[PDB]
Amino acid sequence: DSIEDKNARVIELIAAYRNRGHLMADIDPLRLDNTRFSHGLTLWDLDREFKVVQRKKLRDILSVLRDAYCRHVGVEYTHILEPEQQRWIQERVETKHDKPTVAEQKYILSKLNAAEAFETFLQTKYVGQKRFSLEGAETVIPMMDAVIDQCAEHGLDEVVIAMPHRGRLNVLANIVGKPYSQIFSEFGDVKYHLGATGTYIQMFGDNDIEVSLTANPSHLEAVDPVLEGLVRAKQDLLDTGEEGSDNRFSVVPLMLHGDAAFAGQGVVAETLNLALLRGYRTGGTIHIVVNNQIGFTTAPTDSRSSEYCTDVAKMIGAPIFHVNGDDPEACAWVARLAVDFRQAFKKDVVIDMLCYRRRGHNEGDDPSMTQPYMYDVIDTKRGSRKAYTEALIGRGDISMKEAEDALRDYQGQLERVFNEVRELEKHLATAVDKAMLQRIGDAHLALPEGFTVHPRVRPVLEKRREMAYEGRIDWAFAELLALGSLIAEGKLVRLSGQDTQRGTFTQRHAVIVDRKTGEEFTPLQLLATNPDGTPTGGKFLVYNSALSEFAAVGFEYGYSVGNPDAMVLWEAQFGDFVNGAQSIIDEFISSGEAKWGQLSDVVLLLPHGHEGQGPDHTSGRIERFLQLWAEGSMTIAMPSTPANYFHLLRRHGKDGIQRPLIVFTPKSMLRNKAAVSDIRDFTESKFRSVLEEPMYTDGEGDRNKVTRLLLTSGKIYYELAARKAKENREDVAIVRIEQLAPLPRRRLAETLDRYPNVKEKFWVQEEPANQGAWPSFGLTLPEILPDHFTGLKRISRRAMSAPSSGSSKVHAVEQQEILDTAFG
Amino acid sequence: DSIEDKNARVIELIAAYRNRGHLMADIDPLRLDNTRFSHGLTLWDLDREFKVVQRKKLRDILSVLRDAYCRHVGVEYTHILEPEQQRWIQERVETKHDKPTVAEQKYILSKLNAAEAFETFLQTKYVGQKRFSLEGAETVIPMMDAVIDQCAEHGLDEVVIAMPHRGRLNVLANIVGKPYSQIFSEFGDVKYHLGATGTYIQMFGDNDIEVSLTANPSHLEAVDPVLEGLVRAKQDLLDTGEEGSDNRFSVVPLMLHGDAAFAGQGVVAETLNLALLRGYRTGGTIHIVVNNQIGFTTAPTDSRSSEYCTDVAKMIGAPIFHVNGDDPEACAWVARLAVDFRQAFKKDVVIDMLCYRRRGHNEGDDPSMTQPYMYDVIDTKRGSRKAYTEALIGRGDISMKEAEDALRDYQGQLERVFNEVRELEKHLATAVDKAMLQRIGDAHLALPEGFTVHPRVRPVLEKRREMAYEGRIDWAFAELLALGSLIAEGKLVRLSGQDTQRGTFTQRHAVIVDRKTGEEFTPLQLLATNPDGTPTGGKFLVYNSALSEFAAVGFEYGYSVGNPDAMVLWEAQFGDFVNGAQSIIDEFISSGEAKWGQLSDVVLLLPHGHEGQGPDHTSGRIERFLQLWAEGSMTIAMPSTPANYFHLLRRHGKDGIQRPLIVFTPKSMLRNKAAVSDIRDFTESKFRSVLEEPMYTDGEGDRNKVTRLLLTSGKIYYELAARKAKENREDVAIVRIEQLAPLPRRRLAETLDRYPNVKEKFWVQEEPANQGAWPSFGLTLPEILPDHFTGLKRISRRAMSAPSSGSSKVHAVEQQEILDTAFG
Amino acid sequence: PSGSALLVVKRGPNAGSRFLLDQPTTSAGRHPDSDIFLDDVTVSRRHAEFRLEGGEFQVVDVGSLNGTYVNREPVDSAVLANGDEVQIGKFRLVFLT
Amino acid sequence: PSGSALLVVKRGPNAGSRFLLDQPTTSAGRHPDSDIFLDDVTVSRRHAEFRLEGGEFQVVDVGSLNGTYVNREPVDSAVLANGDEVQIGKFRLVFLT
Numbered sequence A, B: 001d002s003i004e005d006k007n008a009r010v011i012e013l014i015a016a017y018r019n020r021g022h023l024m025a026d027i028d029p030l031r032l033d034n035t036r037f038s039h040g041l042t043l044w045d046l047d048r049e050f051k052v053v054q055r056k057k058l059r060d061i062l063s064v065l066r067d068a069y070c071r072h073v074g075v076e077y078t079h080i081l082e083p084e085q086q087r088w089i090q091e092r093v094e095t096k097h098d099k100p101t102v103a104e105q106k107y108i109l110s111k112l113n114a115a116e117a118f119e120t121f122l123q124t125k126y127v128g129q130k131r132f133s134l135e136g137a138e139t140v141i142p143m144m145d146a147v148i149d150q151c152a153e154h155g156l157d158e159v160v161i162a163m164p165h166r167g168r169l170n171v172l173a174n175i176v177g178k179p180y181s182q183i184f185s186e187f188g189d190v191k192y193h194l195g196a197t198g199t200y201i202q203m204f205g206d207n208d209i210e211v212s213l214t215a216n217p218s219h220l221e222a223v224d225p226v227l228e229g230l231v232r233a234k235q236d237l238l239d240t241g242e243e244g245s246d247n248r249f250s251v252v253p254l255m256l257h258g259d260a261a262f263a264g265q266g267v268v269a270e271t272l273n274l275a276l277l278r279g280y281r282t283g284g285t286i287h288i289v290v291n292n293q294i295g296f297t298t299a300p301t302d303s304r305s306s307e308y309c310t311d312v313a314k315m316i317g318a319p320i321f322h323v324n325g326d327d328p329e330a331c332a333w334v335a336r337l338a339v340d341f342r343q344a345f346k347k348d349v350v351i352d353m354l355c356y357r358r359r360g361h362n363e364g365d366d367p368s369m370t371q372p373y374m375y376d377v378i379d380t381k382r383g384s385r386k387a388y389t390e391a392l393i394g395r396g397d398i399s400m401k402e403a404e405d406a407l408r409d410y411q412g413q414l415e416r417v418f419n420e421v422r423e424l425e426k427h428l429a430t431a432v433d434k435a436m437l438q439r440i441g442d443a444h445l446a447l448p449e450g451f452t453v454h455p456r457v458r459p460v461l462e463k464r465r466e467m468a469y470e471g472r473i474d475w476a477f478a479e480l481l482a483l484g485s486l487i488a489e490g491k492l493v494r495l496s497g498q499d500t501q502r503g504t505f506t507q508r509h510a511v512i513v514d515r516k517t518g519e520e521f522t523p524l525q526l527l528a529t530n531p532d533g534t535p536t537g538g539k540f541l542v543y544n545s546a547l548s549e550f551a552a553v554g555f556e557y558g559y560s561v562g563n564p565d566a567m568v569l570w571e572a573q574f575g576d577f578v579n580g581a582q583s584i585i586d587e588f589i590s591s592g593e594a595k596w597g598q599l600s601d602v603v604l605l606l607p608h609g610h611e612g613q614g615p616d617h618t619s620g621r622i623e624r625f626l627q628l629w630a631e632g633s634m635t636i637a638m639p640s641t642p643a644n645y646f647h648l649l650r651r652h653g654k655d656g657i658q659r660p661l662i663v664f665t666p667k668s669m670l671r672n673k674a675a676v677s678d679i680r681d682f683t684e685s686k687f688r689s690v691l692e693e694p695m696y697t698d699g700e701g702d703r704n705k706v707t708r709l710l711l712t713s714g715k716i717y718y719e720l721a722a723r724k725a726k727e728n729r730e731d732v733a734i735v736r737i738e739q740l741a742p743l744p745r746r747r748l749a750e751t752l753d754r755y756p757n758v759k760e761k762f763w764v765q766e767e768p769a770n771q772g773a774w775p776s777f778g779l780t781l782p783e784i785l786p787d788h789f790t791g792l793k794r795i796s797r798r799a800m801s802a803p804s805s806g807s808s809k810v811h812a813v814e815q816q817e818i819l820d821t822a823f824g
Numbered sequence C, D: 001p002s003g004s005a006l007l008v009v010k011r012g013p014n015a016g017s018r019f020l021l022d023q024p025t026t027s028a029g030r031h032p033d034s035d036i037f038l039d040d041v042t043v044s045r046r047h048a049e050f051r052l053e054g055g056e057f058q059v060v061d062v063g064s065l066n067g068t069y070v071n072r073e074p075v076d077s078a079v080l081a082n083g084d085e086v087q088i089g090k091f092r093l094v095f096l097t
């Protein structure tokens, strides 16, 4: 072995530390794994010089490599595909670090004092707080503080936090800055689920930054896409980020996690997947995993199939720093480095804080029952605050007097919280003018100079200008008429979903693509400018989503929470795939207002209808949304006309009420020649929750001849009306319930009273008997209106375990059976 | 720059190709990115020798590196943490490859002939097949064939496929081997969703292997955990893998995906996360992504935030091979290498097949509307079969005569399918004995020699032996009595969920841990051996799951499909988190039998009940399961007694019917002193769908005194009975409906007829009016039994948008309001 | 079986099936009008011929894509002996006198 | 304000609040009985003292963890001048004659 061999071995040894040094780093404060701690070189090569461009001794290369990668920080970065990102990390991690000042060390110790005094109070004063204990993980408080401080050092506007329950009240008091009089007002509680806002002031700098905490259910990680949507709405408002004039992304998401949930919940990977998308990016999220190496009673070997709980973050080439929770200086240093990386590259950074869970998962849990080895080790562990104070004395960083000052400060914080809580205990029109319709029609033909329209798209543009002036406005254009007029009035409109720009049924064309250059044109964006050239203040933000339901619906819900003034619509490819977002629907959309006072105006567009395309292309599960509904929680509709859908959307965007809207939208009814509206229906009408046939309101129809009343909703009305016209059946009338919830009790009663000779009333639906509106209407209508619906019968498909048959032939037979029964 | 500098530059250049060569590989058959295609060395260093242990010229190092990493295969492996796995790949990828024989090339060409003739027939004969077209991706057929052949070369038992719809009928015909008479029996269809089995025979080898295809909904990726459960049940049956006597894992999962869904669906990461878990591993899955660089109308830049659609696979350190779909030899070679890796290391391998989508997404779609550049390039592309035939001629591998033989073979396959389809068109007791109960009690104290029981666990073991002999058997022991007796009778029992070994409410203790050594003991596993020492054939497979609902419920459903003879139970931590698995419940559990004829006997255990712990710790959403139900789809129950839960489980496991069971299980009722059963209830009874108070069946109660009948289900019975006893109210009786679905019409009527003096009947429930059993019972009971329930009224919590209030104080007031109304 | 031969399918979807060789030419292939119909995509429409001339029984490949094997050896034509194995696509046939 | 001084909070949760200095010793800290109650976890229970002796106004740190600063400079004790900025934890106070 010559010098050439020794040189080669040194280069490979350098690469081995950079790549795999993290596998030998002293990251675990419990040291649970005994066996945890290139070889062509020996002791004789230690003082030999090697090219690095300077010549360095092997012992110096080794001390730099060991300090950078094998101490209390495990660095994973060589999986990153961008070489400039690898160099940036390598240079900051391999340089000699400046020791913190005494004032910085004392400040970190002051945050450990605050975190431990809060935990000590929480565990002593109340029973049932063990499940929320931050004991063994208090270092997360100086870590989060360093994140927020570093964001303030960059002069950013706000840090928005999402986190599970563990240490939440400690974060409210010591990070958000909420006083104990507000935190301990009642006697876990709703307090572990509510949102909050506060102001963070730098200790050593000149800036302030807003700090907020979003609301969340107990469902671990479900809030992750909600936080991103909320941050993105705040960034769009501040004219920062993707849809802003600056590239600062000055609203930062700070996302906290547990080790078992971070690996097990699919919504994590769905949310990471959004990190660099044009429609969803927030300029990089700062993640903190509180890695206590346990999940209730479950060991990490039963929770994940990889070395680290953070390995899913490699999905987007994010850097990952595993840091020892017993070293608060390294924890604060990693936090500042994470923020600097996020600012330089606009990409997620993951901090894996290795720590422990001092207590059992909850009250009455002796965790040594299932993890005796771990808890025999934890019973010998001294706290973070005492260990750090002792480290500072031993290093000579602080005197014994200064350590006494710190213990004094600690006892004073402990006295303060115990005494404060003790004293607290003993104390508009939706119609637009013709000019608006024409302008939105004209916008579809106001193409940029030399734009080449696809020959199949050109008739759509020309038909819209034609409809705007002549009428017979179809469903797809009425939607764009509603969104376009809101933009012209100054509203921000965000529309997204799978293939939503063009539309699943090739009906929308909200974005059109140049046949020769691939250039995009958005006709509705022209409505953001008044005829005089001044901006209206409005905007059209239309995107194709990722192929996700859970993260996409969660993002749109969060976006609507972040900007109550925006019109926010999410569209399912088919309503049948929205069950993929069931956790978001159950935990945020349908219930957030009642549980947390958190309001959302999000719209869900669910393509729905029996057309013979199978059980996954037929239903948005109307029955499930109706079951979730309670007075004032949501508006649920199934409009049958383009103009009534237009009025519904305009009412939703202009009512000054924050309440989700669920719309069951059409598929074949988009091109049904009878399902078109007149210009007058847009300029001289409003949203009608109950509709009659045009022969009674506009024609020469006789309502006194009617003996059989058919109540329905959706596209089946047109088939019922076609059979009625062919068979010339004046004895039968069809009434449509456009607004399914809240039930329009008053309008329904007034409409039914115009038919004094009805002997029998039937609810007609395409859906099986256990589905559609019948399970709720069948029960509620006779109770709510007994003089109108006592004796109401059902006409539907038979009850089924799936939304429909898989056969289009069976569908057709069943569809003809419903019409034959309705007119039998 | 000396030799030392040149040497260093060569080592770094070697590392750069291994790490990042894949970024320059010619993987895209469309070459859409023009800009796609260490530097201290020059032309003068090309013939200089460098240490590699042999000395090699730079030009030779470069040709090996370029051939291995920069041709038609992009290799990603240096992210793998196991060095032995990196070496294994590096050695197989950097060695000189033996060119395939003419017979192997001709065989691959025969598979391209088969794939293209099938596609040509499918697109010509039927309308509405464009959405399933495999045109531009036909190479997936020789690729899958090479996977299955390589599994047969290892002498494995079966390959089980899960895939979306694209090319499914082509896979049925050309991989599974189903004849056209079965494939084209009807006129997308249910055929794209059904399961199938076949026999694969090696062309050049001596083995056969079974090939099956699992059923699936349209929900992309939802089947992924279902496939894993199915494979794991098949491996357990064959005594292979984790729970087998051999380490062969001789049932192989072959999982197909699309590029947009693989990145966007969270269930992918949840399923990868299961790959090395003891309770879920299947010895590695072979993944194939049909990467056509599009998702309906959406470009990859709107679908993912990373370089590759396969980057989520880095979550588990899986190797990834990006292969050019226009090179079928490299595609077949990567497939064989993937199987060899899977066999050597029992870990997933991902194949990213880069290809294109020749047609629009469906009928009437001109894809140049949204992707004009891509489709102008695709319109110039010649097919895979013609290009490969032309490559073989140009290389001199085949003569012009042999190429003519191949074209002849192709036309013959085309004629065969067109003509065949043309002709097809013109043509037991659940009770156990006392000895069984005692044996299961005794098993809890039959500890291994020197086992140290935790002092808090010891009373549980002793109380079970006591209950087995003396009675007052609680809920937790009755469950183990049911599972234990099934094992003793020879049944395989699989039980899993979050913290399911110990139990969320510290009640199960199915596995106990040695206080000093951490050793595990499973008392019920002793029932797998008869008193004579012979095995019963039974087994207890009990695990703690990952922190997942979607993948965990999907796995248990697939496991039950894979082994209809197993007792399979999944347990939610609280029923409130099962909505995380809503896609599995809607698409497989509740509906798979009606849609595909696919049967499952899976059990879902859902902890449920109003106890003041908030809207995420109260409800399993009984109302949602009841809404999904249709005759013969599922059994839904809420037992109130330990013995009735025991009989329910034994009936489910012994009835010889494959039908899912939904059980709403207790929390505080586990330790309710009144909710205990006698020995006699286990030895001399059966499952009772309707229960009366023990004062009428066993006591001195007078049913003729009853004027008010209270119908209920669950734990509220005990509070209703306590109030009745305290107030001595003989005029009120309480009837329990234990089986919620199918409604026990006959037993309910017989029970109500024993109270001839009832004037008023009320349905009593803890749940809000829009939740629990009332929305379905309120509507169905008066219709089904009009002489018993016409006039039935409700007593419940008010209708809410969440399962409960967040306040335990409000809960207590509401709970007392229900009892006060019931006895008002 | 006076002067005749038998082909028995040993490997393939119709394992156990027997074909009699007693005509001058006996066609084997995927065409349904083949004398010996071997229904697998690995078999060409026109694949092989079993020719009987004088006393010898011969197998001849007639332009198939995957070829014809006699006792694991590829052949254009071969005189068959008792107990020989003929491979036509994935099918394995035993020749018997 | 004859011979007295004023402290005005410029940075902190109570920005705009004014404290009068006219006693011999004026305590500043997190204890609610402090003369100047500065309610932030960065402030120690007993943190600083504003001492008036003769004509000079002095700030003195009484054993706080995060210390006391005068015009961005850490001090154990310092004579205050008109317009000086005193930092006690995250609070910034301006001293005025």
Ligand SMILES: Cc1ncc(C[n+]2csc(CCOP(=O)(O)OP(=O)(O)O)c2C)c(N)n1
Binding pocket: A166, A218, A219, A220, A257, A258, A259, A260, A261, A262, A290, A292, A294, A295, A296, A357, B498, B547, B573, B577, B580
């Ligand atoms: C989606 C979901 N499933 C299940 C639960 C129940 N649960 C509460 S805590 C817990 C374990 C959490 O483990 P980890 O994520 O490591 O966090 P830790 O409690 O250790 O901080 C589980 C399964 C939940 N709240 N959410």
Ligand SMILES: Cc1ncc(C[n+]2csc(CCOP(=O)(O)OP(=O)(O)O)c2C)c(N)n1
Binding pocket: A498, A547, A573, A577, A580, B166, B218, B219, B220, B257, B258, B259, B260, B261, B262, B290, B292, B294, B295, B296, B357
């Ligand atoms: C979970 C789910 N969401 C939405 C859809 C609707 N859908 C059908 S095809 C498609 C795009 C698929 O893209 P990719 O996965 O790349 O597959 P490809 O069709 O290109 O093979 C979508 C969104 C679905 N079937 N399942």
Ligand SMILES: [Ca+2]
Binding pocket: A601, A651, A652, A653, A654, A655, A656, A657, A658, A659
């Ligand atoms: Ca609104």
Ligand SMILES: [Ca+2]
Binding pocket: B601, B651, B652, B653, B654, B655, B656, B657, B658, B659
């Ligand atoms: Ca059964």
Ligand SMILES: [Mg+2]
Binding pocket: A258, A259, A260, A290, A291, A292, A293, A294, A295, A296
């Ligand atoms: Mg944890």
Ligand SMILES: [Mg+2]
Binding pocket: B258, B259, B260, B290, B291, B292, B293, B294, B295, B296
């Ligand atoms: Mg695709």
